[PDB]
């Protein structure tokens, strides 16, 4: 038995002693503050466990306990949504009419005149409108009662207390040894089967036994208070057979492999449910079954205590070719002896997954009546875009940290990491050329369109009435997807999503999903997206590759991961660290995500969202102006920003006035960022000296000497303020626009 549980007993005593000794974790900060830099260094080095201890075992134990604390915070955050739905919401009135009642689960206290924020959301309720989509998520689970929300909140509180106790227990009572964490094959098998496949299996079971009958009865017109309770549906084959006439046969067709008898509640019809404008829940349960079987099957791959299985060291070391030398040899030790490498991979995967979630949940609305809730769709898309962008920047940050700290040349000789590091100039040069080519083309077409329209030459533009740039490949892929049911998806009733072409889906006048037509403006903005992604990749990859050394500075690894410069020498070595590369790439991530969400908002308001009247008359929100106005920068400025800021600037005196307040405040914070971003430390230090003179004159000098913020801290403060102001301005603008139309 090689895979075993080895655990130390009572390693660290639980005491409130180092709570009163701040900065105890590091050697330098524990000696007490002399200046007002020890405070910021205390805050910056709190989670840098690799610089506190040289033992990987203690670092891993700290990571595990911190994971438990994070999971406790997330459980409390789930419990807040369930409790606010139970006690502070209009979820019942929304259930009785989920097309005219606006969801709201957040009520303000009247003290200062802020009771105007309690708007008329419908159903005899006053509160702030909710764009989280938790109401549709609860309706997709069959939570028609307000008691089940309360008990879900109580269970979430219990689970959060459990995670707090587990975090204390695994650091102070039973902390696992280093050999426990390095069982990556066992961890991989257990995650792939028990977490993913068993979660899919249990959720498919809940779906089949609770959400399918309750949502079927809800779509049939039965009021929520006359629907059988989920425990009355769980153990009633007669009632389920009344709803789905396949439970008469019971579990026997499952074991006899006659799975075709279960096609009443396990379908592959595709498309959207016409009643709710969402995916069929039978398709969802079938999807979760397929995923559960696939994940449990995949969790049987890696070797554990028994002789069957794979070793991941042998898989990696067998993959090598002529052009790559030793191949993947030595990556197993890298990924089993370093946490920063695992962050660099997992953050990239999680950011890309969040972006995939954003692209998939708008064209395929998975919750009932979420497609006709336009604020929910816009908020979810923009949210997951921003989360994905932040995580994909953090992946490059931790790759740089690994390259500075945990890299070893003796371990990684002539493998893929060494070969990548030995030709980094070619990579950075060619990616530089690609960035310049994409930028010149994609942006100069916009500038050329601006010039032609300003010179009174619309016939010389890059438009559909002019020189055309038709995205022929995307149109071909759309035509392939539209013809998939029957030909390349023979057991399919409808298309995967209606964005690829097909039929307009309408739920009580509003458009749920209709085909999205691609023109030359779509070609132009997709090339803009590719260019912005490429420049962000250029900055982050240059930071990762040149983290150890460069032609300018041969010993950059000896200076650390983050450091301000190496003096004014060599003409100037400002922002040479990989940290400054992450700092510069975060701005370009912000630019890319802002352009992506602007494209989404304008295209969906212009060509998808709207109303339908008699004889299929489609009237969109903005009037189909994306095709001719998204070709010029002036068209963007006038028809998107100026035209859609009318809702956020006229929100004063109404229930949306908080959005205007946050609009102004986020503009203020964004402008406040440039103070740190443009200026430098020495001026502020001299001004602080001038203030310290007056303080010394009035016997007011603090013993902790006041200092200006450090150069790295000044850059970090400016970047954080810039991101907060930008995301706040876009947040308030989107929410105030899309709530009011």
């Amino acid at each position: 038995s090689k895979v075993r549980v080895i655990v130390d007993k009572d390693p660290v005593a639980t005491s409130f002693e180092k709570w009163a000794q701040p900065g105890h974790f590091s050697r330098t900060l524990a000696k007490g503050p002399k200046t007002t830099t020890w405070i910021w260094n205390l805050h910056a080095d709190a989670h840098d466990f690799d610089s506190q201890t040289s033992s990987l075992e203690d670092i891993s134990r700290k990571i595990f306990s911190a994971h438990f604390g994070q999971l406790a915070i997330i459980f409390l955050w789930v419990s807040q949504a369930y409790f606010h739905g139970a006690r502070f919401s209009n979820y019942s009135a929304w259930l009785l009419n989920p097309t005219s009642i606006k969801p709201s689960a957040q009520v303000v206290w009247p003290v200062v005149g802020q009771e105007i924020l309690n708007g008329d959301v419908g159903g005899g309720f006053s509160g702030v409108q909710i764009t989280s989509g938790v109401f549709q998520m609860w309706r997709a689970s069959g939570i028609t009662n307000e008691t089940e929300l309360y008990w879900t909140a109580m269970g979430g509180l219990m689970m959060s207390a459990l995670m707090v106790f587990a975090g204390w227990f695994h650091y102070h009572k039973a902390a696992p040894k280093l050999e426990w964490f390095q069982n990556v094959e066992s961890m991989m098998n257990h995650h792939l089967a028990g977490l993913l496949g068993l979660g899919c299996l249990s959720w498919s079971g809940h779906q089949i036994h609770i959400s399918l009958p309750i949502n079927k009865l809800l779509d049939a017109g039965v009021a929520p208070q006359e629907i059988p309770l989920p425990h009355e549906l769980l153990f009633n084959q007669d009632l389920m057979a009344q709803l789905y006439p396949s439970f008469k046969k019971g579990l026997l067709p499952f074991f006899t492999l006659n799975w075709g008898e279960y096609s009443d509640f396990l379908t592959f019809k595709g498309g959207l449910n016409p009643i709710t404008g969402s995916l069929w829940l039978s398709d969802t349960a079938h999807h979760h079954l397929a995923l559960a079987v696939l994940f449990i099957f995949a969790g049987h791959m890696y070797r554990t205590n028994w002789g069957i299985g794979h070793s991941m060291k042998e898989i990696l070391e067998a993959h090598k070719g002529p052009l790559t030398g030793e191949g993947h040899k030595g990556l197993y030790e890298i990924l089993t002896t370093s946490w920063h490498a695992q962050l660099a991979i997992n953050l990239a995967m999680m950011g890309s997954l969040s972006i995939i979630v954003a692209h998939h949940m708008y064209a395929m609305p998975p919750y009932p009546y979420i497609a006709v809730d336009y604020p929910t769709q816009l908020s979810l898309f923009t949210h997951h875009m921003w989360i994905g962008g932040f995580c994909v920047c953090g992946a490059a940050a931790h790759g740089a940290i690994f390259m500075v700290r945990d890299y070893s040349p003796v371990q990684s000789y002539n493998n893929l990491l060494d070969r990548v590091l030995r030709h980094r100039d070619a990579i950075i040069s060619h990616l530089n050329w690609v960035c310049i080519f994409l930028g010149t083309h994609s942006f100069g077409l916009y500038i050329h369109n601006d010039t032609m329209r300003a010179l009174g030459r619309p016939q010389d533009m890059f438009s559909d009435k002019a020189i055309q740039l038709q995205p022929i490949f995307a149109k071909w892929v759309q035509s392939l997807h539209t013809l998939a049911p029957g030909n390349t998806a023979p057991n399919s009733l409808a298309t995967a999503s209606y964005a690829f072409g097909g039929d307009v889906v309408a739920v009580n006048g509003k458009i749920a999903m209709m085909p999205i037509q691609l023109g030359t403006a779509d070609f132009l903005v997709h090339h803009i997206h590719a260019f912005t992604i490429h420049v962000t990749v250029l900055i982050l990859l240059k930071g990762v590759l040149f983290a150890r050394s460069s032609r300018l500075i041969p010993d950059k690894a000896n200076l650390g991961f983050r450091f301000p410069c190496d003096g004014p020498g060599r003409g100037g070595t400002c922002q040479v660290s990989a940290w400054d590369h992450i700092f510069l790439g975060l701005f370009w991530m912000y630019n890319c995500i802002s352009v992506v969400i602007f494209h989404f908002s304008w295209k969906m308001q212009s060509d998808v969202w709207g109303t339908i009247s008699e004889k299929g008359k489609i009237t969109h929100i903005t009037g189909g102006n994306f095709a001719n106005s998204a070709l010029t920068i002036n068209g963007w400025l006038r028809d998107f920003l100026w035209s859609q800021a009318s809702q956020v600037i006229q929100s004063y005196g109404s229930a949306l006035s908080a959005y205007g307040i946050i609009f102004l405040g986020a503009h203020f914070i964004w402008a406040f960022s440039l103070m740190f971003l443009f200026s430098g430390r020495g001026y502020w230090q001299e001004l602080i000296e001038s203030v310290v003179w007056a303080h010394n004159k009035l016997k007011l000098a603090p013993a902790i000497q006041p200092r200006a913020l450090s150069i790295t801290q000044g850059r970090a403060v400016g970047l954080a303020h810039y991101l907060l102001g930008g995301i706040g301005t876009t947040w308030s603008f989107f929410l105030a626009r899309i709530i009011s139309v």
């Binding site: 032609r551 300018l552 010993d555 190496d566 003096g567 004014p568 020498g569 060599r570 003409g571 070595t573």
Partner: protein, 80 residues
């Protein structure tokens, strides 16, 4: 080329010589301090101006001072 000067507040604690990445500084005998040595800059044409010596000086307002001046292919750190 930059110009490097060492003033008589030197204590001969050698940190500037160790901090130098371009072999500009060296220790010469002296009699004005307890250590019996003072820093010197005999190879100021190899100075790049990164001021690592000025970060390493412990004396109040550093004794070794680097003044940025003319730029050559060595003081710019150009490999091309």
């Amino acid at each position: 080329s930059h110009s490097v000067r060492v003033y008589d507040t030197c204590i001969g604690c050698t940190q500037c010589v160790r901090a130098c990445p371009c072999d500009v500084l060296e220790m010469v005998p002296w009699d004005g301090c307890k250590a019996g040595q003072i820093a010197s800059a005999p190879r100021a044409e190899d100075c790049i101006g990164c001021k690592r010596c000025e970060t390493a000086c412990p004396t109040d307002f550093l004794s070794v001072r680097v003044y940025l001046g003319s730029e050559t292919t060595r003081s710019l750190g150009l490999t091309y």
